[PDB]
Design a protein around this nucleic acid. Structure first.
Lengths: 181, 128, 48, 194, 208, 114, 181, 55
RNA sequence: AGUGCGCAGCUCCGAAAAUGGAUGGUGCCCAAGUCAGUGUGUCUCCCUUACAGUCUGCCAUCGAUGUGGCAGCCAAGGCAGAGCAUCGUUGUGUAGAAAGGGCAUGGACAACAGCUGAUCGUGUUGGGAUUGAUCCCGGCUUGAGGCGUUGCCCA
RNA sequence: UUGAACAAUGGAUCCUACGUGGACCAUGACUGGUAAGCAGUGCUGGUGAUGCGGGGUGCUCCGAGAGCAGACUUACAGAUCCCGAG
C-alpha cells in the first residue's frame, strides 16, 4: 500500500525512583501511532490503568521509532485487537498482506472503521504477529497466498489527472482496454 | 505656507460615502440630514449585514487635505478689498470666494484687485 | 480583539483650573522650572 | 537528467525572439544587443521579416532557444541619433530641487546621463504644430523622410551582412523568420517551451 | 431547420447512457461558465435507481399541486427533454439575469433533430452511466418513465431515430471510402515530401 | 489583408471573489482554457489581461491609431491563483462590470519571463 | 555532549534519559469570547490576551499546573534552537517604558545591562537554554504576535493527541511556529 | 492498479526477482524495443515530443 | 468442512393526519450516503474565506518624551487644557453619563469704517466642502416694510 | 539564596449625578411535576446591550468579537450544481 499514516514506536519507561522504590519496574510498550506525541500518550494511558504510574510521576527512557527492516517483501500480519462498541468490548483477530507492519496497521485501522465503525482511540492493539502462508485462516488472504495469482482488469475506469480530465470527450470510451490514456 | 495641495494627495482622500438618514427615502418628512438612530429594534443601528454605512470618525480625512477643494486650495469668504489684501500672501493656498450678497459694483473691484494680486476667485464670473 | 488591561489614564492633574491669567503665568514659570531644573520642590509647586 | 537551478531567461546577441505586442505581433526577430537594462535592439531583417531596426522590452518578447551565431558582424549603431528622445527639454518641468545626494547613486546617474549626446535638429523628433495645418505637415514629411533615409543607411549596413550570414548558416532560417508565430486552439502557452 | 436554430452554435452532448442529475450538474456548471450546450436524446438518459423506485418518485413529485389553482401550480412535464430542462434549471440560479442567461444557453432536445445531427456530439465522462455506476447497481430510462406518466411520443421518436441512423450509416460508408483515399493521397505525398515529425534530432541550425 | 495573429489565451470571468453570501468586487476569478491544475497557473501569474465589451458610442481606439471603435477595454493583471482547478485571481481597473460574468477575457503573454 | 552521551548509551546498551524540557513556547489558539474566570485569569498571567500570541515559559510544577488548566485554549511545545532564533529576529518586541518597542541592541543594553546582557544573542541564549536570567529576558520581551498560521489548524476543539490542535505538541510546535511567523 | 497500465507482454519469472536476474531477463526478452514498437508507445512519444519541442 | 450460540457495522419491518412540499432545492447510488485515513513549510489537486490573526496607511482616543525661544540657520509652529515633533496603546454598545468637542435658532451688549436698489431676505435648482450636525457658491424667483460674520450674555 | 512561581501604570484617600431593581438561555448540580417552549434553584458564560462567518431560515448553538481602507493568512465550517473552494 501507500503511506500508512502510522509510525511504529517501541517506547520504554518507568517511574521516577522514589526512596522507597529506588529501582521501579521498567515497561516496554509497542505503539502504532501517527506520531511520537500520540505514541507516548498511549504509553502513559497504559502505564496508568495497568501499573498506577502517571505521566507526571513516570519517566521515559526510550522511544525508538522502528523502521521496517525489508519493505520489499510481502508479509501476512495477523493483528489481535480489542475495541469498544456502543455496547461493551469485543476481541478481534484480523490479518492483512502488506510489505510493512505499519502498513498492515493502517490497513487494520481503516478496515475496522469501515466494517465496524471503530475509531483509533477506541481500538487497542493486542499483540501483532507475522504468519507463514500456511497459517493464514481467512479466505480473502488464502486466495492471494498462491504463487501465481492472475486476474484481468475488466470494468476499469482509467484514472487520470485533472490536467486532462476530458469534460466533453468527443471520442468513445471503452471500459475494457489497457488504459494508457 | 503658500503651497497648493497637489493632485497626488487630493487623490489619496478616503472615499467618504453618501451618508443619509435612514428611511429618508420612505417619507418626505424625514429629511436627508443625518441623525444617529436611537431605535431599539433598528437594524440600521444594530449594523446588520447589508445596511448602509454608519457615520463615524474613521471616515474623517487627514488635516492636510480636509476642507481642501478639487482646486487644491482652501476657500475664504471675502466681502471687501480688505479680505483680498488679507489673502495677498496666500494666493496659492486659498481662493477668494466672494460672498453671495456682495453686489456687482464691489464684485468688479474685488475681481480687479484679486487678479492683480493673482488670487483665484472661485466665483469671479458671477454678475457681468 | 484582545483581553485588555486598563488603558493608562494619568490620575495627576496637569492643567490649572484657575481662571486667573497670573496664576497661569506662574504655572508657565514653574513648568519651565520643573522641566529644566527638575527638583522635587519645583514639581510639587507645579502640582499645587 | 539534471534539473539544475533556476536562471533568468534573457535575450542574448543573435537570439531569435518573438515580439509579443505592437505593430509586429508574433514576428520573429534577431536580438542584436542590449541598450538599457531590459531594452534590446532587434531586427527581423526588413527584407526577411519586414521589422526594421527596432527596440523591444524584454517583457514584450519571447526568448526562444534559437541562437544565430551573430559573431563577426558590425553592430555599431548611433543609438541616440537613430532613436530620438521624443520628450523634449529632457528633465525640466520644475526647478531642480537640488540633487542633494553628494557622491554615490545620484551623482553616478547624473554624470552618466550628462555623458550621452542629443539627437540634433534633423535626427531628433518633431513636436506637432499647425502653421495653417500644412506649413508644419510638409516640413514634417520631409523631416521624417530624411530621418528614415539616414536610418536606412545603418539598417542596410546591418542587414546586408546579416542575411548573407543566415543564408550562409542554413537557408531555411530566412523563411523561419518570415513566418509569424500564432496560437491555435491546441496550443497551451503554459506548456510550450521556446 | 428553422431560422433561430440555423443561427445556433455550441456543443452537442449525447445524453444517452448518462446519469440525469450528474449530467444536469456538469451541463449547468458549463452553462454558467458560458458554454452553449445542447443535450440531445433526452429519452435515453439514465437515472440511478430501479424503474419502480423512480416511477414512485415521479408519482410523489407530481402529487405536488397548487390547491387553489393548479394551472399556476408546479408544472410536471411529460417530455424527457423538459424534465431535464427543469433539473438543469434547479441546478442553475434561474431567478437572476446571469442565471436566466445560462438557462437560455441550455438547448435540450429529444431524439436528434437537424441542427444538432449535423454536428459532432460528445459525452461527459463524469455523468456517464457506464463510467460512473457500478455494474452491480440498477438503473432506469427517462423515456420509460415519461411514457409511464404519459408522453405518447416515444415510438414516434424511435422511428425517426431509425431513419436518422440509416442516413448516418450511408454517410459513414461514404466517409470510410473518402478516408481510405485520403490516406492514399497522404502516402502519395509522403513519396514526394517526407513528413518531418517531432521525434527528430535532425531539426537544428546546423541542419534544416 | 494583413495576417491576423493571436497572441493571447482566452479565459472566462467566473464571478468575483466571494464567500457563500458576500463578495469582493475588486478581485475577479478567471478560468483559463486548458488550464486545469494549480501548477499550470504559474505561467499566467503576473500577465496582463483585458476584458472587451461593446458600447454604443465610438470611443478612441488604440493609443496613436486616431480611429475610434465600438469596443471598450478594461485592463488588468493576473495576481494569484484561486483554488486547484486552474482559476486565477485578477485585479482590473476599473473593477470589472457585473455583466462581465460568463464572458471571455484575453490574457496576453506579457510581461513575459518564461 | 548530549549526542556523545546518546552515542555511548546506544553503543553499550544503556538508556539515555533525555533531559526533560525546561522552556516551552505557548500559543493562544482559542479566542476571547465565552471565557471562564479561572482560565481567563491564568491566560492574563501568561500574557496570552490576544489570539495567536505566544510566550516562552519555564516548565516546572507551578507553571505546568496552570498550563494544564488553560490547555483547551492554548498549545505549547518545546521549540528548537533555530525556531527560537527566527522568533527573536522576526517577531520580538520589547515591553519597556510601558510601550511596545522594536528590539535594538541599545534598548537591550538599557533594559538588561544590569545582568551583563548587551545583545540579542544573549536573549536567544537564555531563552533556549534557560540560564539564570530567563525571567528577566522573558519579562523584557513582549508577547509575540503571530499571524494566523498557513495551512491552518486541524481542529481548535480537540486535543493534539485527538487529532486536534490543543494541549502539548511536545516537538510539533516547531511545525506550528514555522507556519505562524 | 488504478495507476498502472498493462503492456502486451510478460516475462517468465518468480515472485520478487532480484535486479541481477530481472535486468538480464528484460534484456534477453527485449522488452524495451518490443514496447517502443507498439502503438501506445508511439502515441505517447508524439505527445511527449510535442510537449518538449522547441520553437 | 458442516452444524449451534452469540456479538458488532450498515440495511429492512416495527413507522399512522389531515392545503402540495421539502437532507434548504436539485438530485445523488464503486454517492453528491456513511466509517476511517491524507493533503507534508515537501503534496501533478488541499484548497476556499469572517468585520478574527499579521503588516501597512489614515481618523479618533488615552498616554510617554522633548518642547511650547534662555534654540546651529532657514520653513513651520508660536491661543501653555492651545500649538509643534516622535513614539506607543486602544477602537461594539441598550439604559445612563461626560467640569469631552462641535453644528444650529431668537434677541441684548460689543467688534467686523461687514454686505445691500450695480438688488437683502425667503424660496427653488445645480455645484463644492464636511465623519456628521451642517457650511459656502453659481442660476432663477424676488425686491428690502433688508441681511450677515466673531466674542459674550439672556433663552 | 533579596530566601516560591507568574503577572501587574499601580496603591491609598474621598466626593459626587444618574440608570437599574419584570429578566431569559445553555450544561448529570439539581428540586416539584407523567411531562411541558412548565415552575423554582446552583457555578459559569451568554442574550438583554451583539453586529460579523457558519448552522437554508432562527435574539441564546459553533467561531469570533465589530474605526476607515490595502495586502496576506486563517477560525468554525465547507467544495456535484445552486455557492467561493477536488
Amino acid at each position: 500500500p501507500g503511506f500508512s499514516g502510522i509510525r511504529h514506536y517501541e517506547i520504554v519507561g518507568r517511574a521516577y525512583p522514589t526512596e522507597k522504590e529506588p529501582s521501579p519496574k521498567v515497561y516496554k510498550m509497542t505503539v502504532f501511532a501517527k506520531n511520537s506525541v500520540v505514541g507516548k500518550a498511549r504509553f502513559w494511558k497504559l502505564m496508568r490503568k495497568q501499573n498506577k504510574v502517571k505521566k507526571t510521576h513516570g519517566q521515559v527512557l526510550q522511544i525508538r521509532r522502528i523502521f521496517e527492516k525489508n519493505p520489499n517483501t510481502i508479509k501476512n500480519y495477523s493483528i489481535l485487537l480489542r475495541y469498544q462498541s456502543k455496547t461493551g468490548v469485543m476481541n478481534v483477530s484480523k490479518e492483512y498482506r502488506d510489505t510493512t507492519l505499519c502498513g498492515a496497521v493502517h490497513q487494520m485501522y481503516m478496515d475496522m472503521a469501515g466494517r465496524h465503525h471503530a475509531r483509533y482511540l477506541d481500538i487497542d492493539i493486542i499483540g501483532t504477529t507475522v504468519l507463514k502462508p500456511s497459517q493464514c485462516l481467512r479466505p480473502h488472504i488464502r486466495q492471494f497466498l498462491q504463487h501465481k495469482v492472475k486476474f484481468p482488469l475488466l470494468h476499469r475506469i482509467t484514472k487520470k489527472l485533472p490536467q486532462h480530465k476530458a469534460t466533453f470527450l468527443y471520442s468513445k470510451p471503452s471500459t475494457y482496454r489497457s488504459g494508457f490514456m | 505656507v503658500n503651497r497648493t495641495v497637489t493632485r497626488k494627495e487630493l487623490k489619496k482622500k478616503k472615499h467618504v460615502p453618501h451618508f443619509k438618514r435612514y428611511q429618508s427615502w420612505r417619507h418626505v418628512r424625514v429629511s436627508e440630514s443625518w441623525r444617529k438612530p436611537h431605535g431599539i429594534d433598528s437594524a440600521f443601528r444594530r449594523r446588520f449585514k447589508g445596511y448602509p454605512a454608519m457615520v463615524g470618525i474613521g471616515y474623517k480625512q487627514p488635516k492636510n487635505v480636509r476642507h481642501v477643494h478639487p482646486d487644491g486650495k482652501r476657500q475664504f469668504l471675502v466681502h471687501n478689498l480688505k479680505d483680498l489684501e488679507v489673502l495677498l500672501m496666500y494666493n496659492k493656498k486659498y481662493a477668494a470666494v466672494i460672498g453671495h450678497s456682495v453686489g456687482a459694483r464691489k464684485r468688479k473691484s474685488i475681481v480687479t484687485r484679486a487678479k492683480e494680486l493673482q488670487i483665484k476667485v472661485t466665483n469671479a464670473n458671477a454678475r457681468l | 480583539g484582545i483581553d485588555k488591561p486598563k488603558q493608562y489614564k494619568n490620575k495627576d492633574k496637569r492643567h490649572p483650573t484657575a481662571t486667573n491669567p497670573y496664576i497661569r503665568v506662574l504655572v508657565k514659570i514653574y513648568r519651565f522650572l520643573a522641566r529644566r531644573v527638575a527638583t522635587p520642590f519645583n514639581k510639587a509647586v507645579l502640582k499645587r | 537528467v539534471r534539473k539544475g537551478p533556476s536562471k533568468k531567461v534573457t535575450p542574448t546577441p543573435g537570439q531569435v525572439l518573438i515580439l509579443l505586442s505592437g505593430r509586429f505581433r508574433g514576428r520573429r526577430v534577431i536580438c542584436l544587443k542590449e541598450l538599457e537594462h531590459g531594452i534590446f535592439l532587434v531586427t527581423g531583417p526588413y527584407k526577411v521579416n519586414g521589422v526594421p531596426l527596432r527596440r523591444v522590452n524584454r517583457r514584450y518578447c519571447i526568448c526562444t532557444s534559437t541562437h544565430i551565431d551573430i559573431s563577426g558582424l558590425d553592430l555599431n549603431i548611433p543609438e541616440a541619433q537613430i532613436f530620438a528622445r521624443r520628450k523634449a527639454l529632457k528633465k525640466v518641468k520644475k526647478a531642480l530641487k537640488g540633487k542633494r545626494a553628494r557622491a554615490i547613486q545620484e551623482k553616478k546617474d547624473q554624470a552618466e546621463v550628462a555623458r550621452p549626446e542629443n539627437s540634433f535638429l534633423k535626427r531628433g523628433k518633431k513636436t506637432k504644430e499647425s502653421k495653417s495645418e500644412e506649413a508644419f505637415f510638409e516640413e514634417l514629411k520631409e523631416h521624417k523622410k530624411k530621418k528614415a533615409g539616414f536610418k536606412q543607411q545603418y539598417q542596410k549596413q546591418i542587414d546586408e551582412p546579416l542575411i548573407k550570414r543566415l543564408k550562409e548558416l542554413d537557408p531555411l532560417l530566412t523563411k523561419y523568420l518570415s513566418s509569424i508565430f500564432t496560437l491555435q486552439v491546441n496550443d497551451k502557452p503554459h506548456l510550450m517551451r521556446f | 431547420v428553422k431560422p433561430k436554430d440555423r443561427k445556433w452554435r455550441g456543443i452537442v452532448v449525447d445524453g444517452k447512457n448518462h446519469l440525469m442529475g450528474r449530467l444536469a450538474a456538469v451541463v449547468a456548471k458549463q452553462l454558467l461558465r458560458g458554454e452553449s450546450i445542447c443535450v440531445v436524446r433526452c429519452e435515453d438518459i439514465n437515472i440511478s435507481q430501479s424503474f419502480m423506485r423512480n416511477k414512485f418518485r415521479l408519482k410523489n413529485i407530481m402529487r405536488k399541486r397548487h390547491l387553489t389553482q393548479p394551472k399556476r401550480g408546479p408544472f410536471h412535464y411529460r417530455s424527457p427533454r423538459k424534465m431535464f430542462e427543469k433539473v438543469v434549471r434547479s441546478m442553475l440560479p434561474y431567478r437572476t439575469a446571469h442565471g436566466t442567461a445560462a438557462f437560455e444557453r441550455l438547448r435540450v432536445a429529444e431524439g436528434i433533430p437537424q441542427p444538432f445531427a449535423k454536428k459532432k456530439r460528445c459525452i461527459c465522462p463524469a455523468a456517464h452511466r457506464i463510467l460512473r455506476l457500478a455494474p452491480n447497481r440498477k438503473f432506469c430510462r427517462l423515456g420509460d418513465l415519461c411514457t409511464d406518466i404519459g408522453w405518447r411520443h416515444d415510438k414516434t421518436i424511435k422511428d425517426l431515430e431509425g431513419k436518422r441512423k440509416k442516413l448516418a450509416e450511408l454517410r459513414w460508408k461514404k466517409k470510410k471510402e473518402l478516408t481510405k483515399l485520403r490516406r492514399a493521397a497522404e502516402r502519395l505525398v509522403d513519396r514526394i515530401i517526407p513528413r518531418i515529425e517531432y521525434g527528430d534530432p535532425k531539426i537544428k541550425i546546423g541542419s534544416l | 489583408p494583413k495576417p491576423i495573429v493571436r497572441l493571447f489565451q482566452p479565459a472566462v470571468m467566473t464571478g468575483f471573489k466571494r464567500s457563500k453570501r458576500k463578495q469582493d468586487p475588486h478581485v475577479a476569478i478567471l478560468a483559463i482554457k486548458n488550464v486545469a491544475t494549480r501548477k499550470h497557473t504559474d505561467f499566467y501569474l503576473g500577465k496582463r489581461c483585458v476584458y472587451l465589451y461593446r458600447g454604443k458610442k465610438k470611443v478612441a481606439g488604440r493609443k496613436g491609431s486616431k480611429v475610434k471603435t465600438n469596443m471598450r477595454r478594461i485592463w488588468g493583471r493576473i495576481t494569484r491563483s484561486h483554488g486547484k482547478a486552474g482559476c486565477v485571481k485578477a485585479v482590473f481597473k476599473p473593477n470589472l462590470p457585473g455583466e462581465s460574468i460568463g464572458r471571455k477575457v484575453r490574457i496576453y503573454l506579457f510581461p513575459s519571463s518564461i | 555532549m548530549l549526542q556523545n552521551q546518546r552515542r555511548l548509551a546506544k553503543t553499550f546498551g544503556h538508556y539515555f534519559v533525555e533531559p526533560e524540557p525546561k522552556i516551552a513556547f505557548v500559543i493562544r489558539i482559542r479566542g476571547i469570547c465565552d471565557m471562564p474566570p479561572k482560565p481567563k485569569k491564568i491566560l492574563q498571567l501568561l500574557r496570552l490576551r490576544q489570539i495567536f500570541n505566544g510566550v516562552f515559559v519555564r516548565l516546572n510544577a507551578a507553571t505546568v499546573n496552570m498550563l494544564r488548566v488553560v490547555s483547551p485554549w492554548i498549545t505549547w511545545g518545546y521549540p528548537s534552537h533555530q525556531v527560537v532564533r527566527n522568533l527573536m529576529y522576526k517577531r520580538a518586541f520589547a515591553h519597556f517604558a510601558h510601550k511596545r518597542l522594536p528590539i535594538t541592541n541599545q534598548l537591550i543594553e538599557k533594559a538588561l545591562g544590569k545582568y551583563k546582557i548587551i545583545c540579542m544573542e544573549d536573549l536567544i541564549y537564555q531563552l533556549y537554554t534557560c540560564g539564570p536570567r530567563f525571567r528577566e529576558v522573558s519579562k523584557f520581551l513582549w508577547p509575540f504576535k503571530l499571524s494566523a498560521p498557513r495551512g491552518g489548524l486541524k481542529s481548535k476543539k480537540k486535543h493534539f493527541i485527538e487529532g486536534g490542535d490543543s494541549g502539548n505538541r511536545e516537538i510539533y510546535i516547531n511545525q506550528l511556529i514555522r507556519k505562524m511567523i | 492498479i488504478k495507476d498502472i497500465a498493462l503492456t502486451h507482454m510478460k516475462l517468465k519469472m518468480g515472485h520478487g526477482l532480484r535486479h541481477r536476474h530481472l535486468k538480464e531477463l528484460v534484456a534477453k526478452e527485449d522488452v524495451l524495443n518490443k514496447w517502443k514498437k507498439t502503438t501506445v508507445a508511439r502515441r505517447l512519444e508524439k505527445q511527449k515530443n510535442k510537449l518538449n519541442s522547441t520553437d
